[PDB]
Design a protein around this ligand. Structure first.
Ligand code: CDL
Ligand code: CDL
Ligand code: CDL
Ligand code: CDL
Ligand code: PLX
Ligand code: PLX
Ligand code: PEE
Ligand code: 8Q1
Lengths: 121, 49, 115, 54, 347, 98, 140, 88, 175
């Protein structure tokens, strides 16, 4: 709908070139830590389902779970940030190019505006 | 003990363990290198450093 | 226009032949003459009872192969295109797939009647 | 003294064809345990033919 | 049935769906639907019994009628504008025919009658395939032509689907019919937001597919097709029943579980338009789905039902084949709401 | 819209109504499906011939192909139904009622 | 179609109670006919005469409910000299609900139906006044 | 639902209806305890025909033994009740 | 208004559709479908599509032969129904005929919309093209383009046909 057709968009890129002009998410980003936590929970559930010692059955596969979730989450966060940046860019440009639709109104102080008073009693 | 041979060997499957650890280290190293590359590229584009 | 006249003439001639056949001779029909035909005796059941078919799979395959025939028919015209290589490749692909389907039905005992 | 847990009578109300049995659906039966209905003993009607004498 | 033939049939089903997804020509989308149905019919009949034959026949008849209406709508659109490309669909009569054909293919009300019976008549693997993968192509086509969606017709069918799914699920004891009715209600929720935002449709579809895959793999792990046969699982796999209860609560739409995220977003979207009454009605109707999910949870996890003596033997044996992605699907089906903003990577 | 177009669309509507009403036999419903295919073929051919869409001329042919597939599929299913009941009556397909 | 709703709405609220009652009973008859068609399709009546009996029963019940609602609401609005107020609609709905109770010969259905129908009727009137949309056109 | 909870009165009424439809039995001389041999003057073949009429009325096979000993309408009613477990 | 040949053919097309849509036993249903197939072949022949008409006639003749075999095998009864042997079949047939006639009258007398849009009639000869060009035929060249332009279509169609053979074998396998 809103963003599917946008000029100069490569179909299946998942990460346009202009996206590199944005700050990469830090490796300690709390969303990345939550993705790692999701990977850890998946590993523990895997241990419990196969009837293995939940905390300490397979450390290598739990590490693979956590690293896979973190790996996917990094690029997911990059793409999400890029799409939000695109939304903001397009909105600002549209505001700038259509001034008559977004006029700056007169600034009034509360000493001039008359608000009706509703007593509580 | 166990009358059957317990298909999952009493010693770890060293091939599977090695490959799993290897892909974990490879993914971590790739992620670190990629993060460095985007940090450098972003700094270069925006005139920061 | 002329094909319409031809078909009308042929159908009318056959209908006139049937009319002569049915109104010229002397008809004398009674119940025993018009009874259903058996070698000598009366039928046990009816001819409208189900008649098991042992080649149903071959019939469905015939439907599919018949459609393959409609695919293959425009080949004399297709042979006049400029790029003969892609045309030849595609025609051979179609015929090879037809042959492979025939082989698959054959090897999986599909061409044999039900016993 | 102990916590109440369901008994056979309680569990049998979840064992019907549908919940809320009614007049129309009272004669419904739950499907077979493995989803294989028994084969019908359909009579194979062969064709009987007089071959000869004519 | 041979493993190679089964692989080929599954690949043909998937290739038909992909062909529908990647085509810009109406004839190619139709051909993708045809190929999908053709390869799908035997998969429903993999385990041969009269019930499977019944389900395959009903599915075939429904999908063939839908294909006829689809092609007729395409041809009428071609007649009134010589365009084969999938676009705005310049004709309104053809648009109504197309919407009805796709709704019949999806199972939206009042074309819902075939879904519970086809789901109940086939195995759990075929039911998983039918209730997850078969929903992609019609929804993709509907997403592409949302500009010409008649809001009245689509919203009526969506509200009808939610109501009918909620009401029909209340009467069910078999698990496959419960899954079918939940599928109908979720399809209604998915298509209700279609004229406003297709990103919300895709988000709801992904969350629904994750929850449905988790539910079906849990029901395959514990070989249960009825309520009472699932009542026995606590005595053999208590962990499986606990995970199943949490998944059921997630499908019920309770926060902070994943199943809350789609409807929440959907409500917000319709509130960006005026659309106040409809989201309220949809929430109060999804209450019914939550009710029969909770009934299943009471039977399976929160109470201990009586067992049988032979179960002791089952205590001595483990599972021969373990379904991969089950832990990941459970986690994605429950603990994913904090990552809600990532839906921006869907448009 | 010429009158022949109206007749073809009426034929399609009649075939669709005939399919949506079931009497007893599944073969009759398969026949109604084939009639819908035939009407769609004639409609497409007339539209493509009137507006000289040259590359669209293969389109009806492909249509016919998949028509056969549907027919084949239905026929296969019908055999199985018969093998379970001895008749192709749709009233026997009621197991999934419960 | 929706042209029945137009013939109903084009009449002013507190004028021509006979025409409003006619439009309301037309809408009721249409709804009852659709319900009868679906009921016959899904639950066959085992005979043609029983089917026409069920169709006539449903259509008459729906038409009577619609006629009573329209007549009562118009009369209340005109007598009270207070149009554009949902009490008239609520009164009409409750009266319509009462008719259903009488048709089905049940006090609970009548009492239960009256409260719900009256509430529903009032909500529709408020939506007409304020401008609530059941099927909102996509604007954003 | 299915056929109603058939009772003894309906069974007796249908049995008596069957006997009245028989053309070798005088309707007025027929009663509940009328012996098929010594009040109506029939032989074993008429008894066989009457048992067959019961069989095709009540729709369940009645085999020889414990059917040769059905000599009045009363025993027919009792046999049907015992077969169908009708106690009312 | 010129010999009405196309109109007559389309009317017979609709009549045959009504005939096999009443469902009067599949033998007569196949007869009606054969009549409609030949009549449609004629309809599209009158517009210049000779190959397509002949092809659809051939395909439906083969299909109706297979359907006749299947009707004799597993879709028959002691007294097969004809259009006048049953009240429902006759009622549907007569209703279809009457509704087609009412449609034709409503279209010919007035240019009033029935379902899609208001029609004109005036004889379908008016909408022709006056095309004076070619030592070939456009339909034949377009159909022959399936091997040079339609590589993708040929691939998908051949795959679907092979899969269909496999699918019918799997379905009718039994067990
Ligand atoms: C928001 C803040 C954070 C919260 C996040 C959400 C919660 C946490 C994440 C959840 C997922 C995590 C793990 C999931 C799999 C675990 C399943 C399990 O059974 O565990 C067994 C296992 C113990 O079993 P065991 O030792 O193998 O041997 C005993 C046998 O297994 C004996 O086995 P058994 O067969 O006898 O067990 C049978 C039992 C088994 O049944 C169960 O155990 C239930 C399974 C839980 C379902 C999880 C589904 C997915 C998660 C959704 C959570 C939703 C949260 C939202 C709120 C809604 C709540 C529903 O079933 C029953 O008896 C029937 C009871 C019916 C009750 C119904 C309620 C069940 C649902 C409850 C869900 C709530 C979350 C629970 C989280 C913790 C559970 C372990 O538990 C653990 O040991 C894991 C605990 C966590 C490990 C952390 C340790 C790491 C190191 C510590 C230090 C920390 C950092 C150090 C650095 C600091 C510097 C010094
Ligand atoms: C402004 C608009 C006005 C309002 C419109 C919106 C409100 C609609 C109200 C209709 C309520 C729907 C259901 C009716 C009651 C249930 C059926 C029934 O048996 O009734 C017997 C019931 C008592 O008889 P009973 O023998 O004791 O009941 C039999 C057993 O209980 C058990 O009987 P059963 O087991 O045989 O049940 C019948 C059977 C058959 O099931 C049905 O009856 C289905 C009927 C639902 C149709 C809804 C009609 C709405 C039409 C709107 C357009 C109007 C155009 C103008 O049920 C089923 O087998 C399954 C039902 C569900 C399966 C799926 C069916 C849904 C079809 C789709 C719905 C409509 C689709 C429309 C197009 C969709 C295309 C995208 O009540 C009646 O006597 C019939 C009259 C019902 C009252 C209607 C109120 C009309 C008031 C209009 C006043 C307007 C004033 C002016 C305004 C300005
Ligand atoms: C391009 C998109 C459009 C596509 C679609 C286009 C469609 C138009 C083209 C159609 C061409 C037709 C050519 C062939 C069709 C094939 C028919 C077939 O195969 O029959 C199989 C089917 C199965 O037969 P069977 O299994 O062999 O025999 C067993 C018995 O039939 C059953 O066994 P039983 O005796 O034990 O059962 C009891 C008895 C029970 O019989 C009944 O209960 C029926 C009596 C209902 C009373 C009708 C209302 C009376 C008062 C209404 C007055 C109107 C307003 C007046 C003012 C207000 C009044 C208060 O029988 C029934 O169950 C029959 C129920 C079905 C009735 C007909 C279904 C049609 C739709 C449903 C209508 C429901 C009517 C309710 C009111 C609707 C609104 C007016 O045959 C039937 O269903 C019987 C009638 C068939 C003959 C008439 C067919 C014409 C209908 C065509 C469409 C309707 C009109 C379209 C006009 C559109 C405008 C241009
Ligand atoms: C939140 C805080 C707590 C609140 C929650 C609790 C309170 C609310 C819930 C409780 C009350 C609601 C109950 C609803 C009705 C229940 C009926 C029912 O379920 O049917 C099944 C049930 C059994 O089903 P069935 O098998 O069909 O009937 C067999 C009968 O047993 C066989 O019966 P039978 O053969 O012996 O005789 C039948 C016949 C013969 O009748 C009788 O047998 C006895 C007479 C009963 C009703 C006649 C009234 C006589 C006494 C009232 C005198 C004035 C009172 C003071 C009012 C002015 C205040 C200054 O009945 C009638 O024809 C009665 C026609 C109705 C006329 C009454 C109209 C009163 C409207 C209210 C005006 C005032 C509003 C308050 C304004 C205050 C402003 C400051 O039906 C009944 O047995 C009861 C029927 C009698 C209706 C009583 C209704 C009067 C109570 C006021 C209702 C207003 C509250 C709700 C507002 C909206 C309602 C429209
Ligand atoms: C419960 C969570 C369910 C999630 C489902 C599985 C999660 C893993 C997803 C697998 C990632 C790989 C898919 C694609 C990667 C490379 C292909 C790339 O080219 O795809 C492009 C972009 O990739 C995908 O489009 C986005 C996939 C991202 C999925 C994650 C979002 C999940 C929703 C938010 C819930 C929070 C979950 C947190 C993580 C578990 C497509 O561009 P475009 O041709 O233009 O799209 C056409 C269709 N549109 C425009 C209508 C969308
Ligand atoms: C091969 C293709 C080309 C052929 C071209 C020639 C076409 C030939 C016409 C077809 C008829 C030829 C058949 C040969 C004998 C005619 C038989 C029949 O048509 O005539 C009578 C049919 O007539 C009626 O049966 C009785 C006459 C009453 C009706 C009056 C005739 C209608 C016109 C009105 C009067 C005008 C008379 C002629 C003056 C113009 C016989 O009736 P019926 O007995 O059952 O049948 C038995 C025939 N038998 C005796 C020879 C065995
Ligand atoms: C808004 C619309 C307002 C609708 C008001 C009508 C609702 C009445 C429900 C209150 C209960 C009254 C009652 O007694 O119901 C009886 C009555 C018939 O008697 P039974 O109990 O079914 O038969 C058992 C003995 N043979 O039940 C019913 O059929 C009606 C129950 C459901 C009403 C329909 C509600 C549908 C609302 C959403 C529609 C979309
Ligand atoms: O009621 P009961 O006291 O048991 O009386 C029995 C019986 C009347 C036979 C009594 O006389 C008796 O038991 N006699 C002893 C001899 C005996 O049992 N004889 C039986 C003869 S068997 C026999 O002949 C078979 C004849 C089959 C001929 C069939 C003819 C078909 C006609 C064509 C129909 C269209």
């Amino acid at each position: 709908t809103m963003m599917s057709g946008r000029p100069g968009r490569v179909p299946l890129q998942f990460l346009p070139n202009e996206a590199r002009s944005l700050p990469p998410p830090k490796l300690t980003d709390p969303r990345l830590v939550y993705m790692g936590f999701l990977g850890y929970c998946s590993g523990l559930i895997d241990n419990a389902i196969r009837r293995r010692p939940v905390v300490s059955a397979g450390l290598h596969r739990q590490l693979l779970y956590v690293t896979s979730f973190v790996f996917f989450g990094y690029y997911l966060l990059k793409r999400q940030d890029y799409m939000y940046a695109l939304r903001d860019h397009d909105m600002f440009a549209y505001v700038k190019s259509h001034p008559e639709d977004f006029p700056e109104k007169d600034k009034k102080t509360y000493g001039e505006i008359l608000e009706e008073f509703h007593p509580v009693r | 003990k166990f009358y059957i041979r317990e298909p999952p060997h009493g010693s770890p499957d060293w091939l599977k363990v090695g490959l799993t650890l290897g892909t974990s280290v490879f993914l971590w190293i790739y992620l670190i290198k990629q993060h460095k590359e985007d940090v450098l590229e972003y700094k270069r584009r925006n005139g920061l450093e | 226009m002329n094909i319409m006249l031809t078909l009308l003439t042929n159908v009318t001639l056959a209908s006139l032949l049937v009319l002569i056949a049915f109104w010229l001779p002397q008809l004398n029909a009674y119940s025993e003459k018009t009874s259903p035909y058996e070698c000598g005796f009366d039928p046990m059941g009816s001819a409208r009872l189900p008649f098991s078919m042992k080649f149903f799979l071959v019939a469905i395959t015939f439907l599919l192969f018949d459609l393959e025939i409609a695919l293959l028919l425009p080949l004399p015209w297709a042979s006049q295109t400029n790029n003969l290589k892609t045309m030849l490749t595609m025609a051979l692909f179609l015929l090879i797939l037809l042959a492979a389907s025939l082989a698959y039905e054959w090897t999986q005992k599909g061409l044999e009647w039900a016993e | 003294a102990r916590q109440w847990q369901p008994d056979v009578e309680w569990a049998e109300q979840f064992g019907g064809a549908v919940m809320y049995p009614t007049k129309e659906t009272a004669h419904w039966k739950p499907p077979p345990w493995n989803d294989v209905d028994p084969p019908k003993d359909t009579l194979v009607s062969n064709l009987t033919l007089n071959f000869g004498p004519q | 049935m041979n493993p190679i033939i089964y692989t080929t049939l599954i690949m043909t089903v998937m290739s038909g769906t992909m062909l529908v997804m990647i085509s810009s020509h109406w004839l190619l989308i139709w051909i993708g639907f045809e190929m999908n149905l053709l390869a799908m019919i035997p998969v429903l009949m993999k385990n041969f019994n009269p019930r499977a034959t019944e389900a395959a026949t009903k599915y075939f008849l429904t999908q063939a009628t839908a294909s006829m209406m689809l092609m007729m709508a395409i041809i009428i659109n071609l007649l009134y504008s010589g365009q084969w490309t999938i676009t705005k669909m310049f004709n309104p009569v053809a648009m109504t025919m197309m919407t009805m054909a796709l709704a019949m293919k999806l199972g939206l009300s009042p074309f819902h009658f075939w879904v519970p019976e086809v789901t109940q008549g086939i195995s759990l693997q075929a039911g998983l395939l039918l209730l997850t993968w078969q929903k992609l192509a019609p929804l993709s086509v509907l997403c592409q032509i949302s500009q010409s969606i008649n809001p009245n017709l689509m919203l009526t069918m969506a509200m009808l689907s939610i109501l009918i799914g909620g009401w029909g699920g209340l009467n069910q004891t078999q698990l496959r019919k419960i899954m079918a009715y939940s599928s109908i209600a979720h399809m209604g929720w998915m298509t209700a937001v279609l004229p406003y935002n297709t990103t919300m449709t895709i988000l709801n579809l992904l969350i629904y597919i994750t929850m449905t895959l988790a539910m079906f793999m849990l029901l395959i792990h514990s070989s249960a097709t009825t309520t009472l046969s699932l009542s026995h699982t606590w005595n053999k796999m208590p962990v499986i029943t606990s995970l199943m209860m949490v998944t059921l609560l997630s499908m019920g739409g309770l926060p902070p579980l994943s199943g809350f995220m789609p409807k929440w977003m959907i409500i917000q979207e319709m509130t960006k338009n005026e659309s106040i009454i409809m989201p309220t009605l949809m929430a109060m109707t999804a209450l019914l789905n939550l009710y029969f999910y909770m009934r299943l949870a009471y039977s399976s996890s929160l109470t201990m039902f009586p067992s049988t003596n032979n179960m002791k033997m089952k205590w001595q044996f483990e599972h021969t084949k373990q379904m991969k992605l089950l832990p990941t699907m459970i986690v994605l089906s429950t603990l994913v709401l904090p990552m809600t903003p990532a839906l921006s990577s869907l448009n | 819209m010429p009158l022949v177009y109206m007749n073809i669309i009426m034929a399609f509507a009649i075939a669709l109504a005939g399919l949506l009403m079931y009497r007893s036999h599944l073969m009759s419903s398969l026949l109604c499906l084939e009639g819908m295919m035939l009407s769609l073929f004639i409609m497409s051919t007339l539209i493509i011939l009137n507006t000289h869409f040259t590359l669209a001329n293969m389109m009806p042919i492909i249509l016919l192909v998949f028509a056969a597939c549907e027919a084949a599929l239905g026929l296969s299913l019908l055999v199985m139904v018969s093998n379970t009941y001895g008749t192709d009556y749709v009233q026997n397909l009621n197991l999934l009622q419960c | 179609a929706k042209t029945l709703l137009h013939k109903y709405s084009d009449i002013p609220e507190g004028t021509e109670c006979h025409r409003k009652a006619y439009a309301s009973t037309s809408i009721g008859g249409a709804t009852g006919l659709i319900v009868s068609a679906y009921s016959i399709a899904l639950k066959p009546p085992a005979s043609f005469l029983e089917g026409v009996a069920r169709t006539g029963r449903y259509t008459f019940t729906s038409a009577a409910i619609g006629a009573i609602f329209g007549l009562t609401s118009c009369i209340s609005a005109q007598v009270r000299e207070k149009p554009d107020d949902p009490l008239n609609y609520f009164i009409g709905g409750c009266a319509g609900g009462l008719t259903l109770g009488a048709r089905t010969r049940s006090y609970g259905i009548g009492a239960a139906a009256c409260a719900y129908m009256g509430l529903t009727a009032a909500l529709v009137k408020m939506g007409q006044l304020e401008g609530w949309q059941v099927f909102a056109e996509p604007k954003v | 639902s299915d056929a109603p909870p058939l009772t003894l009165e309906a069974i007796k009424d249908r049995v008596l209806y069957v006997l009245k439809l028989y053309d070798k039995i005088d309707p007025e001389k027929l009663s509940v305890n009328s012996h098929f041999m010594k009040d109506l003057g029939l032989d074993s073949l008429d008894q066989v025909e009457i048992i067959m009429a019961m069989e095709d009325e009540f729709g369940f096979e009645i085999p020889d033994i414990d059917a040769e000993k059905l000599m009045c309408p009363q025993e027919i009613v009792d046999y049907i009740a015992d077969k169908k477990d009708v106690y009312e | 208004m010129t010999m009405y040949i196309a109109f007559i053919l389309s009317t017979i097309f609709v009549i045959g559709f009504v005939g096999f849509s009443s469902k009067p036993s599949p033998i007569y249903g196949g007869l009606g479908l054969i009549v409609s197939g030949g009549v449609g072949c004629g309809i599209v022949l009158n517009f210049g599509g000779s190959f397509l008409g002949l092809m659809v006639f051939l395909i439906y003749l083969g299909g109706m032969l297979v359907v006749f075999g299947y009707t004799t095998a597993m879709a028959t009864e002691m007294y097969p129904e004809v259009w006048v042997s049953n009240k429902t079949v006759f009622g549907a047939f007569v209703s279809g005929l009457m509704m087609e006639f009412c449609m034709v009258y409503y279209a010919l007398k007035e240019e009033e919309v029935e379902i899609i849009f208001k029609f004109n009639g005036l004889g379908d000869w008016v909408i022709y093209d006056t095309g004076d060009s070619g030592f070939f035929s456009e339909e034949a060249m377009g159909i022959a383009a399936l091997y040079s332009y339609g590589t993708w279509l040929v691939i998908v169609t051949g795959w679907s046909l092979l899969i269909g053979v496999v699918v019918i074998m799997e379905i009718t396998r039994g067990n």
